[PDB]
């Protein structure tokens, strides 16, 4: 419309209104430069200042150890599918997988090219609905990383706190709930994320990586793939996707100026359980099928008991500007992704709309 | 605070209108309700898009059905490991022409995938040369043959096309991408980065004969198989939407201009008028690329007096010309001209340089 909409999409997905409109006010000559951030040099000064900020601004918002590198690449989370088992693995060396949802899956698949897998544990057989008791995982002894993905963003199921990797180190797939919450860095060798999740556009990936495991990639890896070559470099080996990582540094800043990641938290939490509690709440009329303590607070996943009304409800509710809430071909249904950068507002309309829903259609 | 001439190699100069469109889009794309940059890559904004921005550049460089076109990440520089590994098995080979050092730094990658032959290297003349084709030893049963077109640090560009004796050509089009018709027949790969000459950086563009996609190895990335993206239409995983929208605004506006038979006049125009300041000024600057193969993207030169390159670099920046530089090798200045660097803008570096030559002969 004329008025922007609420945008319940799950990746790419909204952004801040303050970001875009700064961002709309410096396109055609960034803070007297004399050129857009699209035209500028990626070794000249006024791009470095960007991409050095944009790496400050982002190790103060998650608390990140001076010992961990932070890497602004392309390529998206999948080409990190096949950098991770290239650059710490060598080809007979074995990764474990925690398997809480169809991104971690395609993770093993691509791994398996470059290393051997271990799924130690799979959620497939009940929908992907619960994450596992980490006592009981039997991990492989010799394992180089045990690899989880944090928020499975199409089945909603969310990891609170972190399995404790036995002989290696973890690795977390946080594409849909990075800079969502504090997270302990040090826990982790590797967190990577597509920035257009939470944090910016497409065509950013981020990698914060512990600087002990960079090096010694296997010698099939492209060097556009290799985490040495990017950490000397500074993510400027080759050209950067600078006007993106332009925008993720206007995402950061504003996070920082909300009051971090610990209001960021306590807003993302107030706003997803209007929604949980509006489904629990609806006697069976709305269903979530996700275990409760796992529950995302980034992708809320729901169906109807009268599946025949689901295209109803999705239709209706895009004619009222909440769009992009069609749920995954494997479960039908929605899927109502609330981001760092959805309104409160938003969540406000969906619920008072699904009760209006509800009226009518009981 | 006006816009600068803004003389850089890549990314690079935009033309201002499209810059003035995106910035009218940016926050609320036609009444969508949403940005380019919050689009879903499978909705149908989103597809409009990226449909229209692969027919635009159909039309503009004439790419026949005969071809794909795929919209990737990753620079030139993934493509550097992703050709051998599509193209080749391990033990073929790929004929190289290195006519500069992109040209060099595509054989450095190849060789973790395939067999590498340089046939021809211009390294011991500094890079200033192509090749007279009829002599070139290609190898009888290479897979392809490689090309840099335009060596952006060089200025070394291709005019004429070799014949692969056998095989296929593929061509490294990254800083010269829809300056001039090209005949796309000829090729089996036309590649390269948009942030040169279409677009901001983090959009690669890869034109492919479809009888050259598939049976890439086995320890091809998903990421860099081209079968992958051909058949997902670059939307396998999230492209680069924003830049791709960009792109796609490029192209449309070349379109307007009257396309690349008149893209290419007006650079050849503008390159005319540096390169003729250059060769009139009596030795007082320099360019040492063969005249017949000049670049008309990126002119380098130099000073016969070396002391004076830090003044010219500095006085030209305070004059609103920038990122003149030279690269480190060999000193002196690279003016970048790319399509939408403005006819005006290399009049004011030829008067800069008139003046200069009177102020310090």
Same mark, same amino acid.
């Given at each position: ?12 997905? *909204?952004?801040?209104?303050?970001? /875009? ?41 998650? @608390? &990140? ?20 088992? /290239? ?6 060396? *074995?990764?474990?997988?925690?398997? *809480?949802? +169809? ?16 799924? &130690?544990? +799979? ?7 619960? #994450? ?21 963003? &199409? ?51 981020? #990698? ?44 950061? @800043? ?38 409760? +303590? ?28 909440? #769009? ?19 309104? /409160? ?18």
């Amino acid at each position: 419309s004329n008025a922007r909409v609420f945008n319940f999409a799950a990746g790419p997905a *909204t952004l801040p209104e303050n970001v /875009l409109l700064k961002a709309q006010a410096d396109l055609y000559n960034w803070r007297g430069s004399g050129m857009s951030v699209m035209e500028m040099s990626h070794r000249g000064k006024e791009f470095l200042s960007i991409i050095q900020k944009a790496e400050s601004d982002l190790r103060q918002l998650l @608390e &990140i150890p001076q010992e961990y590198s932070v890497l602004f690449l392309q390529g998206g989370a999948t080409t990190q599918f096949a950098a991770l088992p /290239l650059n710490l693995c060598k080809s007979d060396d *074995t990764v474990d997988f925690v398997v *809480t949802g +169809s991104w971690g899956d395609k993770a093993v698949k691509e791994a398996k090219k470059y290393c051997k897998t271990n799924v &130690i544990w +799979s959620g497939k057989s009940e929908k992907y609905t619960k #994450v596992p008791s980490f006592e009981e995982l039997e991990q492989t002894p010799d394992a180089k990383y045990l690899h989880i993905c944090a928020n499975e963003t &199409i089945h909603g199921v969310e990891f609170k706190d972190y399995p404790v990797p036995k002989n290696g180190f973890l690795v977390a797939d946080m594409s849909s709930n990075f800079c969502s919450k504090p997270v302990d860095v040090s826990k982790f060798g590797v967190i990577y994320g597509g920035a257009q999740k939470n944090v910016g556009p497409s065509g950013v990936t981020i #990698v914060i990586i512990r600087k002990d495991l960079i090096g010694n990639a296997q010698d099939i890896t492209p060097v556009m793939l290799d985490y040495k070559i990017h950490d000397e470099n500074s993510s400027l080996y080759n050209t950067p996707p600078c006007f993106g990582i332009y925008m993720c540094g206007l995402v950061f @800043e504003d996070l920082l100026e909300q009051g971090g990641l610990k209001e960021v938290e306590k807003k993302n939490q107030r706003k997803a359980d209007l929604l949980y509690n509006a489904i629990e709440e609806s006697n069976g009329f709305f269903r979530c099928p996700v275990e409760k +303590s796992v529950r995302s607070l980034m992708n809320v996943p729901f169906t109807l008991e009268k599946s025949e009304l689901e295209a109803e409800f999705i239709k209706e509710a895009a004619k009222e500007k909440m #769009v992009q809430l069609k749920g995954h071909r494997s479960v039908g249904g929605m899927r109502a992704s609330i981001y760092n950068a959805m309104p /409160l507002a938003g969540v406000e309309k969906l619920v008072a709309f699904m009760k209006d829903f509800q009226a009518k259609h009981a």
